[PDB]
Coordinates of C-alpha atoms and ligand atoms in Angstrom, one line a residue:
Chain A
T2 CA 7.4 291.9 80.6
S3 CA 6.0 288.4 81.3
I4 CA 7.7 286.2 83.9
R5 CA 8.1 282.6 82.6
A6 CA 10.4 281.2 85.3
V7 CA 11.6 282.1 88.8
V8 CA 15.2 281.6 90.1
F9 CA 16.3 281.8 93.7
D10 CA 19.5 282.6 95.5
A11 CA 20.2 280.0 98.2
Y12 CA 21.4 281.3 101.6
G13 CA 19.2 283.8 103.5
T14 CA 16.6 283.4 100.8
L15 CA 15.6 279.7 100.7
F16 CA 17.8 278.6 103.6
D17 CA 17.9 280.3 107.1
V18 CA 21.7 280.6 107.9
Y19 CA 20.6 281.5 111.5
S20 CA 21.5 278.1 112.9
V21 CA 25.2 278.7 112.3
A22 CA 25.4 281.9 114.4
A23 CA 23.7 280.0 117.3
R24 CA 26.1 277.1 117.2
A25 CA 29.1 279.6 117.0
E26 CA 27.9 281.0 120.4
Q27 CA 28.1 277.5 121.9
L28 CA 31.6 276.8 120.9
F29 CA 32.8 280.4 121.5
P30 CA 30.8 281.9 124.3
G31 CA 30.2 285.6 124.0
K32 CA 31.7 285.6 120.4
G33 CA 29.0 284.1 118.2
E34 CA 27.4 287.2 116.7
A35 CA 30.9 288.7 116.1
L36 CA 32.3 285.5 114.5
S37 CA 29.2 285.0 112.3
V38 CA 29.2 288.6 111.1
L39 CA 33.0 288.7 110.4
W40 CA 32.8 285.3 108.7
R41 CA 30.0 286.2 106.3
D42 CA 31.8 289.5 105.5
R43 CA 35.1 287.7 104.6
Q44 CA 33.3 284.9 102.8
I45 CA 31.8 287.3 100.4
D46 CA 34.8 289.6 100.3
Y47 CA 36.9 286.6 99.3
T48 CA 34.6 285.6 96.4
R49 CA 34.7 289.1 95.0
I50 CA 38.5 289.7 95.5
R51 CA 39.1 286.4 93.7
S52 CA 36.7 286.9 90.7
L53 CA 37.7 290.6 90.3
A54 CA 41.4 289.5 90.3
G55 CA 40.9 286.8 87.7
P56 CA 38.0 287.8 85.4
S57 CA 38.5 284.4 83.6
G58 CA 38.6 282.3 86.7
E59 CA 42.4 282.6 87.4
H60 CA 41.8 282.7 91.1
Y61 CA 38.7 280.7 91.5
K62 CA 38.2 278.3 94.4
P63 CA 34.9 276.6 95.3
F64 CA 32.6 278.3 97.7
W65 CA 33.1 275.6 100.3
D66 CA 36.8 276.1 100.5
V67 CA 36.4 279.9 100.4
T68 CA 34.0 279.4 103.4
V69 CA 36.7 277.5 105.3
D70 CA 39.2 280.3 104.5
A71 CA 36.9 283.0 105.7
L72 CA 36.0 281.1 108.9
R73 CA 39.7 280.5 109.6
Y74 CA 40.6 284.2 109.0
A75 CA 37.6 285.3 111.2
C76 CA 38.8 283.0 114.1
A77 CA 42.4 284.1 113.9
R78 CA 41.3 287.8 113.9
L79 CA 38.9 287.3 116.8
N80 CA 41.4 285.2 118.8
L81 CA 39.1 282.1 118.9
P82 CA 40.3 278.5 119.6
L83 CA 39.3 276.9 116.2
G84 CA 41.1 273.6 115.7
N85 CA 39.8 270.6 113.7
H86 CA 36.8 269.6 115.8
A87 CA 35.3 273.1 116.1
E88 CA 36.0 273.8 112.4
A89 CA 34.4 270.4 111.3
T90 CA 31.4 271.2 113.5
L91 CA 30.7 274.6 112.1
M92 CA 31.2 273.4 108.5
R93 CA 28.8 270.5 109.2
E94 CA 26.4 273.0 110.4
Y95 CA 27.0 274.9 107.2
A96 CA 26.4 271.9 105.0
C97 CA 23.0 271.2 106.3
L98 CA 20.6 274.1 106.9
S99 CA 16.8 274.5 107.2
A100 CA 14.3 276.5 105.2
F101 CA 12.2 279.5 106.2
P102 CA 8.9 277.6 107.1
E103 CA 6.9 279.9 104.8
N104 CA 9.0 278.9 101.7
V105 CA 7.9 275.3 100.8
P106 CA 4.1 276.2 100.3
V107 CA 4.8 279.5 98.4
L108 CA 7.0 277.5 96.1
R109 CA 3.9 275.3 95.5
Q110 CA 1.5 278.2 94.8
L111 CA 4.1 279.1 92.0
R112 CA 4.7 275.6 90.7
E113 CA 1.0 275.2 90.6
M114 CA 0.6 278.5 88.6
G115 CA 2.7 276.9 85.9
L116 CA 6.2 278.3 86.8
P117 CA 9.5 276.4 86.4
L118 CA 11.7 277.0 89.4
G119 CA 15.5 277.2 89.8
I120 CA 18.3 277.9 92.2
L121 CA 21.4 280.0 91.2
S122 CA 24.0 280.0 93.9
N123 CA 27.6 280.9 94.7
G124 CA 27.4 277.5 96.3
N125 CA 29.6 274.8 94.7
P126 CA 27.2 272.0 93.6
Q127 CA 28.5 269.3 96.1
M128 CA 27.4 271.6 99.0
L129 CA 24.3 272.9 97.1
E130 CA 22.8 269.5 96.6
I131 CA 22.7 268.1 100.1
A132 CA 21.9 271.6 101.4
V133 CA 18.7 271.2 99.3
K134 CA 17.9 267.8 100.8
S135 CA 18.0 269.4 104.2
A136 CA 14.6 271.1 103.9
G137 CA 12.3 268.9 101.7
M138 CA 12.5 270.9 98.5
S139 CA 13.8 268.0 96.3
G140 CA 11.6 267.9 93.1
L141 CA 10.5 271.6 93.2
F142 CA 13.5 272.8 91.2
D143 CA 14.0 272.0 87.5
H144 CA 17.5 273.5 87.7
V145 CA 19.9 273.7 90.6
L146 CA 22.8 275.9 89.3
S147 CA 26.2 276.8 90.7
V148 CA 28.7 279.5 89.6
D149 CA 31.2 276.6 89.7
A150 CA 30.3 276.0 86.0
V151 CA 31.9 279.3 85.1
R152 CA 34.5 279.6 87.9
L153 CA 33.3 283.2 88.6
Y154 CA 31.2 284.5 91.5
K155 CA 28.3 287.0 91.3
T156 CA 28.1 289.7 90.4
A157 CA 30.1 288.5 87.3
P158 CA 28.0 288.4 84.1
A159 CA 29.0 284.8 83.4
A160 CA 27.3 283.8 86.8
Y161 CA 24.1 285.6 86.1
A162 CA 24.1 284.2 82.5
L163 CA 23.8 280.6 83.8
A164 CA 20.0 281.0 84.4
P165 CA 18.8 282.2 81.0
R166 CA 20.9 279.3 79.5
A167 CA 19.5 276.6 81.6
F168 CA 15.8 277.8 81.2
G169 CA 15.9 278.6 77.5
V170 CA 14.5 282.0 78.1
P171 CA 15.9 285.6 78.1
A172 CA 16.7 287.3 81.4
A173 CA 13.7 289.6 81.0
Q174 CA 11.4 286.7 81.4
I175 CA 13.0 285.2 84.5
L176 CA 12.0 286.5 87.9
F177 CA 15.2 286.7 90.0
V178 CA 14.8 286.4 93.7
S179 CA 17.5 287.2 96.3
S180 CA 17.9 288.3 99.9
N181 CA 21.0 290.2 99.3
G182 CA 20.4 293.7 98.1
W183 CA 23.7 293.7 96.1
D184 CA 22.5 290.6 94.2
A185 CA 19.0 292.0 93.4
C186 CA 20.8 295.0 92.1
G187 CA 23.4 293.0 90.1
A188 CA 20.6 290.9 88.6
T189 CA 18.6 294.0 87.6
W190 CA 21.7 295.2 85.7
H191 CA 21.9 291.9 83.9
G192 CA 18.3 292.4 82.7
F193 CA 16.2 290.1 85.0
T194 CA 12.9 291.1 86.6
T195 CA 14.0 291.0 90.2
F196 CA 12.5 290.8 93.6
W197 CA 14.4 291.5 96.8
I198 CA 13.5 289.7 100.0
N199 CA 14.7 292.3 102.3
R200 CA 14.5 290.3 105.6
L201 CA 16.2 292.7 107.9
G202 CA 14.4 295.9 106.6
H203 CA 17.6 297.6 105.3
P204 CA 17.8 300.5 102.9
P205 CA 18.2 299.9 99.2
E206 CA 21.9 299.8 98.1
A207 CA 23.1 303.0 96.7
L208 CA 23.9 301.5 93.3
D209 CA 21.8 303.7 91.0
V210 CA 19.5 300.8 90.2
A211 CA 16.6 299.1 92.0
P212 CA 14.9 295.8 91.8
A213 CA 11.4 295.6 90.3
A214 CA 9.9 295.1 93.8
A215 CA 11.1 294.1 97.3
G216 CA 9.3 292.7 100.4
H217 CA 10.0 291.2 103.8
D218 CA 9.6 287.5 103.1
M219 CA 8.8 284.8 100.6
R220 CA 5.1 285.3 101.0
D221 CA 5.5 288.9 99.9
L222 CA 7.1 287.4 96.7
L223 CA 4.1 285.3 96.1
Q224 CA 1.9 288.4 96.6
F225 CA 3.9 290.1 93.8
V226 CA 3.9 287.4 91.2
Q227 CA 0.1 286.8 91.5
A228 CA -0.5 290.6 90.9
Chain B
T2 CA 64.4 290.1 91.9
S3 CA 65.7 293.7 92.0
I4 CA 63.3 296.6 93.0
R5 CA 63.6 299.5 90.6
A6 CA 60.6 301.5 91.7
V7 CA 58.1 301.7 94.6
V8 CA 54.4 302.4 94.3
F9 CA 52.0 303.2 97.1
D10 CA 48.3 302.8 97.8
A11 CA 46.8 306.1 99.1
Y12 CA 44.4 305.8 102.0
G13 CA 45.6 304.2 105.3
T14 CA 49.1 303.9 103.7
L15 CA 50.2 307.5 102.8
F16 CA 47.2 309.2 104.2
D17 CA 45.7 308.7 107.7
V18 CA 41.9 308.4 107.2
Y19 CA 41.6 308.8 111.1
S20 CA 40.4 312.4 110.9
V21 CA 37.1 311.4 109.2
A22 CA 36.0 309.0 112.0
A23 CA 36.6 311.8 114.6
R24 CA 34.6 314.4 112.6
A25 CA 31.8 311.8 112.2
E26 CA 31.5 311.6 116.0
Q27 CA 31.0 315.3 116.2
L28 CA 28.1 315.5 113.8
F29 CA 26.6 312.2 115.0
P30 CA 27.3 311.8 118.7
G31 CA 27.8 308.2 119.8
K32 CA 27.7 307.0 116.1
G33 CA 31.1 307.9 114.7
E34 CA 33.0 304.6 114.9
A35 CA 29.9 302.8 113.6
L36 CA 29.3 305.2 110.6
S37 CA 33.0 305.2 109.7
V38 CA 33.2 301.4 109.8
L39 CA 30.0 300.9 107.8
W40 CA 31.0 303.6 105.3
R41 CA 34.4 302.1 104.5
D42 CA 32.8 298.7 104.2
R43 CA 30.2 299.9 101.7
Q44 CA 32.7 302.1 99.9
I45 CA 34.8 299.1 99.1
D46 CA 31.9 296.7 98.6
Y47 CA 30.5 299.1 96.0
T48 CA 33.8 299.4 94.0
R49 CA 33.9 295.6 93.8
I50 CA 30.3 295.0 93.1
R51 CA 30.5 297.5 90.2
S52 CA 33.8 296.2 88.6
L53 CA 32.8 292.5 89.0
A54 CA 29.4 293.4 87.3
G55 CA 31.0 295.1 84.4
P56 CA 34.5 293.6 83.7
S57 CA 34.9 296.2 80.9
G58 CA 33.7 299.2 83.0
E59 CA 30.0 299.0 82.3
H60 CA 29.2 300.0 85.8
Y61 CA 32.1 302.3 86.6
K62 CA 31.6 305.4 88.6
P63 CA 34.4 307.5 90.1
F64 CA 35.6 306.8 93.6
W65 CA 34.3 310.2 94.8
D66 CA 30.8 309.5 93.8
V67 CA 31.0 305.9 95.1
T68 CA 32.2 307.4 98.4
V69 CA 29.1 309.7 98.5
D70 CA 26.8 306.7 97.7
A71 CA 28.4 304.6 100.5
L72 CA 28.2 307.5 103.0
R73 CA 24.5 307.9 102.1
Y74 CA 23.7 304.3 102.4
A75 CA 25.5 304.1 105.8
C76 CA 23.6 307.1 107.2
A77 CA 20.2 305.7 106.0
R78 CA 21.0 302.3 107.6
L79 CA 22.3 303.8 110.8
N80 CA 19.3 306.3 111.0
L81 CA 21.6 309.4 111.0
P82 CA 20.4 313.0 110.0
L83 CA 22.7 313.5 106.9
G84 CA 21.5 316.4 104.8
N85 CA 23.5 318.6 102.5
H86 CA 25.6 320.4 105.2
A87 CA 26.7 317.3 107.1
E88 CA 27.4 315.4 103.8
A89 CA 29.4 318.4 102.4
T90 CA 31.3 318.5 105.7
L91 CA 32.3 314.9 105.7
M92 CA 33.2 314.9 102.1
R93 CA 35.4 318.0 102.6
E94 CA 37.0 316.2 105.4
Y95 CA 37.6 313.3 102.9
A96 CA 39.1 315.5 100.2
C97 CA 41.8 316.8 102.5
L98 CA 43.7 314.4 104.7
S99 CA 47.0 314.3 106.5
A100 CA 50.0 311.9 106.3
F101 CA 51.4 309.6 108.9
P102 CA 54.2 311.9 110.2
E103 CA 56.8 309.1 109.6
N104 CA 56.0 309.0 105.9
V105 CA 57.6 312.1 104.4
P106 CA 61.2 311.3 105.6
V107 CA 61.0 307.6 104.7
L108 CA 60.0 308.6 101.2
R109 CA 63.2 310.7 101.2
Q110 CA 65.6 307.8 102.3
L111 CA 64.1 306.0 99.2
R112 CA 64.2 308.9 96.7
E113 CA 67.8 309.4 97.9
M114 CA 68.6 305.7 97.4
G115 CA 67.8 306.3 93.7
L116 CA 64.1 305.1 93.6
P117 CA 61.3 306.5 91.5
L118 CA 58.1 306.7 93.5
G119 CA 54.4 306.5 92.6
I120 CA 50.9 306.4 93.9
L121 CA 48.3 303.9 92.5
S122 CA 44.9 304.6 93.9
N123 CA 41.2 303.7 93.6
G124 CA 40.9 307.5 94.0
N125 CA 39.7 309.4 90.9
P126 CA 42.5 311.8 90.0
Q127 CA 40.6 315.0 90.8
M128 CA 40.4 313.8 94.5
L129 CA 43.8 312.2 94.4
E130 CA 45.6 315.4 93.4
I131 CA 44.5 317.9 96.1
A132 CA 44.6 315.0 98.6
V133 CA 48.3 314.9 97.8
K134 CA 48.7 318.7 98.4
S135 CA 47.3 318.2 101.9
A136 CA 50.5 316.6 103.3
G137 CA 53.5 318.2 101.6
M138 CA 54.4 315.3 99.3
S139 CA 54.2 317.3 96.0
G140 CA 57.4 316.5 94.0
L141 CA 58.2 313.1 95.6
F142 CA 56.1 311.1 93.1
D143 CA 57.0 310.7 89.5
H144 CA 53.5 309.2 88.7
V145 CA 50.2 309.7 90.5
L146 CA 47.9 307.0 89.0
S147 CA 44.2 306.5 89.3
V148 CA 42.1 303.4 88.3
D149 CA 39.9 306.0 86.6
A150 CA 42.1 305.5 83.4
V151 CA 40.8 302.0 83.1
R152 CA 37.3 302.4 84.7
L153 CA 38.0 299.3 86.9
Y154 CA 38.8 299.0 90.6
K155 CA 41.4 296.8 92.2
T156 CA 41.7 294.0 92.3
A157 CA 41.1 294.1 88.5
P158 CA 44.3 293.3 86.4
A159 CA 43.8 296.5 84.4
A160 CA 44.1 298.6 87.6
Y161 CA 47.3 296.8 88.7
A162 CA 48.7 297.0 85.2
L163 CA 48.7 300.8 85.3
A164 CA 52.0 300.8 87.3
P165 CA 54.2 298.7 85.1
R166 CA 53.0 300.9 82.2
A167 CA 53.8 304.2 83.7
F168 CA 57.2 303.2 85.1
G169 CA 58.4 301.3 82.0
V170 CA 59.3 298.3 84.2
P171 CA 57.9 294.8 84.7
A172 CA 55.7 294.2 87.8
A173 CA 58.5 292.0 89.3
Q174 CA 60.8 295.1 89.6
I175 CA 58.2 297.4 91.3
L176 CA 57.8 297.2 95.1
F177 CA 54.1 297.5 95.7
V178 CA 53.1 298.9 99.1
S179 CA 49.6 298.8 100.6
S180 CA 47.9 298.9 104.0
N181 CA 45.1 296.7 102.9
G182 CA 45.8 293.0 103.1
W183 CA 43.5 292.2 100.2
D184 CA 45.5 294.6 98.0
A185 CA 49.0 293.3 99.0
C186 CA 47.6 289.9 98.1
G187 CA 46.1 291.0 94.8
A188 CA 49.3 292.8 93.9
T189 CA 51.3 289.7 94.6
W190 CA 49.1 287.7 92.2
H191 CA 49.8 290.3 89.5
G192 CA 53.5 289.7 90.0
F193 CA 54.8 292.7 92.1
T194 CA 57.2 292.4 95.0
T195 CA 54.8 293.6 97.7
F196 CA 55.1 294.9 101.2
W197 CA 52.0 295.1 103.5
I198 CA 51.8 297.9 106.1
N199 CA 49.7 296.0 108.5
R200 CA 48.9 299.0 110.8
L201 CA 46.2 297.3 113.0
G202 CA 48.2 294.0 113.4
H203 CA 45.6 291.8 111.7
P204 CA 46.1 288.2 110.5
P205 CA 47.1 287.6 106.8
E206 CA 44.1 287.2 104.5
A207 CA 43.3 283.6 103.8
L208 CA 43.9 284.0 100.0
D209 CA 46.6 281.2 99.5
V210 CA 49.1 284.0 98.7
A211 CA 51.3 286.3 100.9
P212 CA 53.2 289.5 100.3
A213 CA 57.0 289.4 100.2
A214 CA 57.1 291.0 103.6
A215 CA 54.8 293.0 106.0
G216 CA 55.4 295.4 108.9
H217 CA 53.6 297.8 111.2
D218 CA 54.4 301.1 109.6
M219 CA 56.3 302.9 106.8
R220 CA 59.5 302.8 108.6
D221 CA 59.4 299.1 108.7
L222 CA 59.0 299.4 104.9
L223 CA 62.3 301.4 104.7
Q224 CA 63.9 298.7 106.9
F225 CA 63.0 296.1 104.3
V226 CA 64.1 297.9 101.1
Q227 CA 67.6 298.8 102.7
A228 CA 68.1 295.0 103.5
Ligands
CL301 CL1 27.6 282.9 107.9
CL302 CL1 38.2 292.9 102.4
CL303 CL1 35.8 286.2 81.3
CL304 CL1 36.2 305.9 105.8
CL305 CL1 27.8 294.1 100.2
CL306 CL1 38.2 294.0 80.5
K307 K1 39.4 284.7 79.0
K308 K1 23.6 268.9 111.5
K309 K1 35.7 294.5 76.7
K310 K1 39.5 320.5 106.0
MG311 MG1 32.6 293.8 103.4
MG312 MG1 44.9 286.1 116.5
MG313 MG1 16.8 304.5 108.0
NA314 NA1 22.1 285.9 79.8
NA315 NA1 51.5 294.6 84.1

């Protein structure tokens, strides 16, 4: 079926989270890769635990505050000295990230081939908006969407449903792009055409579903559309 | 409020999963602790991804088959030679586990103080039932409950709701016991009195909720009831 719009996940897709791991190392020598791993794990675990526990948003909390919670748990567990300064510093780092250098032109070869572009993110909008301004992609997106509108995190249907609504098109006609295998898979269940930017070369998730195609980077995504 | 029944989580609580990590090492030398960690992570990730994606069971699959999926993904990712024999062997190991030696008497000091006992498990019942027969705890539980009845995994309300239903008592009057911090916390949200068997001495989850009490083992749980 014909793509008529293309929606992106934020972190790891549009925005390289790398710079947080590197700054963790500096505050916590020898413990950066461990913190950053544990922190991402719990950040995601907490969004799922919450949305699963309250399928109508009973336990929702914005992604920012969930990210603080996860960072705090990870430091306590890993026995790291995280008080106000080191916390503020890592969160600042989180607020303002940079793009994968390949992205911004590829977005143009799509904008130019007549394609509306959006972001759909677990990110609360307050953090999603500045995050976008770090990277020079202001203007490229028609819609910048947050699961905060529905108080439910991916893979919840109400989160995926935001993009058909904003674009005025069925899921089947939106190309859904994510770095996270679980999310490409969840989007495929919802009925999008999906592309998985598998940056670390991992296996497909064993979820009995597969995205339409996958590649290694954003420029592989361009390849695929043009075909 | 007065406890009138006590319900247990299965794995890590009643049943020591240890013996699987040890048998992983033997089939996959140098890679047992890595497999076992990645496998537990994805097993749980997959139950949440599924239930979050289909809040009415649209993507349900029994825990057994989810456990095979997770084991398969973990082996592919970790580049381990898992064909039919090594898979069958690890799954066998999974079917039939042993208790924490402290458990079976502690269950008796509770049965004897006039307390009905149950299991509530992500475990499909087919695997939950034999699992119980490995360990000598047949007879101690009035109800052996599986989220398979509702096609939704914890922390889904419909999963927690199984125990009030079976016991004929409100959540507030059941003591809910788990090893998994996320689950003690989810149960507390549902309204149980909860106890967390924190076996590895981890911090509390940063979920803005805490179980009624926590301890290190089952005998700490006994301590707490008797008080
Ligand atoms: Cl992170
Ligand atoms: Cl977790
Ligand atoms: Cl809902
Ligand atoms: Cl395991
Ligand atoms: Cl995951
Ligand atoms: Cl439901
Ligand atoms: K509702
Ligand atoms: K900065
Ligand atoms: K329904
Ligand atoms: K055996
Ligand atoms: Mg995880
Ligand atoms: Mg600590
Ligand atoms: Mg491989
Ligand atoms: Na939709
Ligand atoms: Na209930």
